Amino acid sequence: VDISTLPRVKVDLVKPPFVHAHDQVAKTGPRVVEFTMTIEEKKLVIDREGTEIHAMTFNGSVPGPLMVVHENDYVELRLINPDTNTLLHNIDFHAATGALGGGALTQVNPGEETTLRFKATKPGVFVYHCAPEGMVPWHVTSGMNGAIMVLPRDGLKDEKGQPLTYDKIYYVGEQDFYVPKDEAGNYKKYETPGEAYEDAVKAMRTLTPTHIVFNGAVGALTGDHALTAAVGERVLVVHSQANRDTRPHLIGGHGDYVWATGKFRNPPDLDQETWLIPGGTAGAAFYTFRQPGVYAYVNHNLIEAFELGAAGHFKVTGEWNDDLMTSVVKPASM
Amino acid sequence: VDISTLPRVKVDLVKPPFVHAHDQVAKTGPRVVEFTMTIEEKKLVIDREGTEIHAMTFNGSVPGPLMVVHENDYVELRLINPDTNTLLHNIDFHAATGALGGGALTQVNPGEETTLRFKATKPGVFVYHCAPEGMVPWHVTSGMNGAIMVLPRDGLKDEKGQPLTYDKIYYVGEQDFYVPKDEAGNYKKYETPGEAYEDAVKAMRTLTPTHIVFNGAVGALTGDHALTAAVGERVLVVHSQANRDTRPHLIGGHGDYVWATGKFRNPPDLDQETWLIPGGTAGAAFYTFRQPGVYAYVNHNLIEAFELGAAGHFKVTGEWNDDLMTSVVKPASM
Amino acid sequence: VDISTLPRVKVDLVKPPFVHAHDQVAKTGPRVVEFTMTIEEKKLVIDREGTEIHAMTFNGSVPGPLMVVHENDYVELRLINPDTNTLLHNIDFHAATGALGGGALTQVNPGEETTLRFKATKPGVFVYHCAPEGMVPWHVTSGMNGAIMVLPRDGLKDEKGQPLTYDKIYYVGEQDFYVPKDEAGNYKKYETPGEAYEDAVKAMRTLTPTHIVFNGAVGALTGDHALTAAVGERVLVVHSQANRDTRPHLIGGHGDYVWATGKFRNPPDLDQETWLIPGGTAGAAFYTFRQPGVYAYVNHNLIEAFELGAAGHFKVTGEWNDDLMTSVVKPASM
Numbered sequence A, B, C: 001v002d003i004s005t006l007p008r009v010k011v012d013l014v015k016p017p018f019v020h021a022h023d024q025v026a027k028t029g030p031r032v033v034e035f036t037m038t039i040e041e042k043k044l045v046i047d048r049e050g051t052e053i054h055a056m057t058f059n060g061s062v063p064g065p066l067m068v069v070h071e072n073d074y075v076e077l078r079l080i081n082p083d084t085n086t087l088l089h090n091i092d093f094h095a096a097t098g099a100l101g102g103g104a105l106t107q108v109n110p111g112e113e114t115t116l117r118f119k120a121t122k123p124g125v126f127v128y129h130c131a132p133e134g135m136v137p138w139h140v141t142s143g144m145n146g147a148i149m150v151l152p153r154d155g156l157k158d159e160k161g162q163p164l165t166y167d168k169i170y171y172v173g174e175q176d177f178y179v180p181k182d183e184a185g186n187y188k189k190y191e192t193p194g195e196a197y198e199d200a201v202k203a204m205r206t207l208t209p210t211h212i213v214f215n216g217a218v219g220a221l222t223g224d225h226a227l228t229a230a231v232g233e234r235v236l237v238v239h240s241q242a243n244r245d246t247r248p249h250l251i252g253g254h255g256d257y258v259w260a261t262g263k264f265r266n267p268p269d270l271d272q273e274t275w276l277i278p279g280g281t282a283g284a285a286f287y288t289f290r291q292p293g294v295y296a297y298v299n300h301n302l303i304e305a306f307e308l309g310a311a312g313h314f315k316v317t318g319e320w321n322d323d324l325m326t327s328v329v330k331p332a333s334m
């Protein structure tokens, strides 16, 4: 069909871990879904010690926001690189077909913009990331990555062909950073991106992240920013990692239905404790909460979780089920 | 149903790689299965060089013993921390729902005990591990982890709905250790756990294990302690890794049926050479032996296997099948 | 059936990434498929800087060539170790059953040869590699590994039982090297293999590759040696990694059907962006090209791809589809 004849709609994005409002069951036929993102280079404090890096972002956040469309919609993105930025950027969608995912068509210097369109032909969650030729891992590992969800037009299904309907959705972007260190082990600081580049390449080549965080910083998804749910609520957690493997795990829960490699035409894996999301992939886990209280949601390399930053919390409200779990004899001397 | 009315039974555990006797087909309805484990902090020699660490164990072994129940049984564990220990401990079951898997309800100082109950609602093999708030990876990577198998009530099945019945079962716990090193590369020794802690955190933060072993030490599953089987015997190998990915492989065999991420409501992967068990997961592989002789069972990062310790042996008895394999021309000059 | 009565055929191998001619649908019943490979120790330049290593090869290439048979054929390999070599070698097939995959039966000193036969009882792609007792990871990580494809007799199938027929096939072998470094970080050179050995073991024990390459060198599958396809062509890419995990990704495409762990009795995963091939495994991805131009095929640890070598190219010929992707507004000031 002629694209000028399709319905169109403009989306307004939200900051992770929240996700812009959408309908699971598509209420139109295929449409052109219009997004705008503004690139922002900015200083970010990433840990409790105060370590500050020069982050490269889509729309001011690490990760960039989650975009949501349906299968066979067209994604039309206006990408803006303001003149207050210093570097060249572009965008590669793993959801898209051709021209290096879009990166060959979207190179923008500071002071430029561009508009890309692609057809979202395959249902799933997918990574998107900046990828300028010759400096690709530097941009990705400076935070310049996010994800897009392409829902089936009829929503998610279980393997029996019955619907799986989530009540809430969160997007957890997991970021490996490589802050350059001196031989004593202290982080270096730099005067310009160009003076940092070789140091950044050397740090990356060690293959050892200095920090691994959710939503851009140690502790970002804790305290006043903990994730929330009620007992009985169905929650979808989309989780991306653009550069290294991760192994997500809900401490005190499970993934009832998990698309570990993120693609909805496949039946989900059931009853997972932990799953493997390869670097360069988005995955998705569906869980119905059964107990109240605090949960930690982690990368289950527990060093990566509890020493390097890859840990957030849920606070869950409701009644405690002693059939599922109880303390028979509380800790006591003996 | 009211829990005080269910059948009960007391289990007596065995040391890995052996597994306490149980029935594949459950002969009772749901029951309360009572276990006791005693925590033991102890010195362990982990390699041929004599490197000695302060291990943290459930029941005196690394890994802790395999517990076996059926789906919808209740697990009731009496956890004892004798006053001859120095640290605080607890337990998190990945099989359980609520209170951080049990860790929030089971904190025991030296001289204390506690009794936890949980309903085993999902069939599979699962990790269990100690997880005291603020020192989680230190306990796990000191050996304080094991696994629990929750069998379907009707036993294991293939994808056609026919039974898979094992003749023998082994439990391989794989442990990554992070022994602190000085700048020359030699292992440090410490006077108290507290004096070691910061050094342990620094070693963990490198993300590079110094040792990766089966059953607690280099060579533990070799020689007089090699695993055994006969030609034609059906063997289930349960394999856990509480903190890092592993890639198991039977040298000279296969995994005929593999639940790589361990959950029995999913159809197994067939005919595997090698499979990925994510850190924080237990998996299970079923194989029928077809040839006698020595096999090595390894993590197929062969450096991890043959230089760092992640290798054991099977000795298999029976007839050699020249149809499956033969030397046509033995090695000779030419 | 008596093996002396079966048909026989002699195969002549080709250099990767090409694959010897074969039929997807087997035109004979089970047969004895005769191969010969000659071991070659040789100097290889692996990067643009000129770093030269002493490689250990099957048939002169890294990886060794792809062998192709059908399920229940017999593989009969004549392995030759000429007297111009210095080391002892053997071969382990992950496709085979017994005697450590063949390694226990195929030990050849320089000046010796041997002939092994095994029945290829399981369909899939599988790793093969040298594995001399006591020096296994040194040989594998010096390049001494390849793969074998065991096709079902009726060819590949989708999950509905309909045929998947590829028009072309490529074999990408991915190699992690561990070139020894001094404390300043410069590569060491050695006078004999024996003088290098301890240094090689120390480098391996860091677990950190210095190089990760396709087809034996940085840039090997680029320029005049880029992979090629036409729009509409069905391509199978077999990808092996004998020692570390990889996460393959076609930049600008997908894996339409992927056997991530390589075994054809399992239904493929659909619509993958990226997939996890565990170390010690071969996998296979089937894709129909839909857009022309340059693609990069990478390990999606982008540091491993673009800094350490794990990147090749496709050049695809044909018409551009503006329905799938177009630049609406080309980059411009604003």
Ligand SMILES: O=N[O-]
Pocket (backbone or CB within 6 Å): A249, A251, A252, A302, B092, B094, B100, B101, B131
């Ligand atoms: O049980 N979560 O480490």
Ligand SMILES: O=N[O-]
Pocket (backbone or CB within 6 Å): B249, B251, B252, B302, C092, C094, C100, C101, C131
């Ligand atoms: O074939 N096992 O390295």
Ligand SMILES: O=N[O-]
Pocket (backbone or CB within 6 Å): A092, A094, A100, A101, A131, C249, C251, C252, C302
């Ligand atoms: O989108 N490939 O990095």
Ligand SMILES: [Cu+2]
Pocket (backbone or CB within 6 Å): A056, A088, A089, A090, A130, A131, A132, A139, A144
């Ligand atoms: Cu950028």
Ligand SMILES: [Cu+2]
Pocket (backbone or CB within 6 Å): A092, A094, A129, A280, C249, C251, C300
């Ligand atoms: Cu990418």
Ligand SMILES: [Cu+2]
Pocket (backbone or CB within 6 Å): B056, B088, B089, B090, B130, B131, B132, B139, B144
């Ligand atoms: Cu403990």
Ligand SMILES: [Cu+2]
Pocket (backbone or CB within 6 Å): A249, A251, A300, B092, B094, B129, B280
């Ligand atoms: Cu855990």
Ligand SMILES: [Cu+2]
Pocket (backbone or CB within 6 Å): C056, C088, C089, C090, C130, C131, C132, C139, C144
């Ligand atoms: Cu060799």
Ligand SMILES: [Cu+2]
Pocket (backbone or CB within 6 Å): B249, B251, B300, C092, C094, C129, C280
């Ligand atoms: Cu092997």
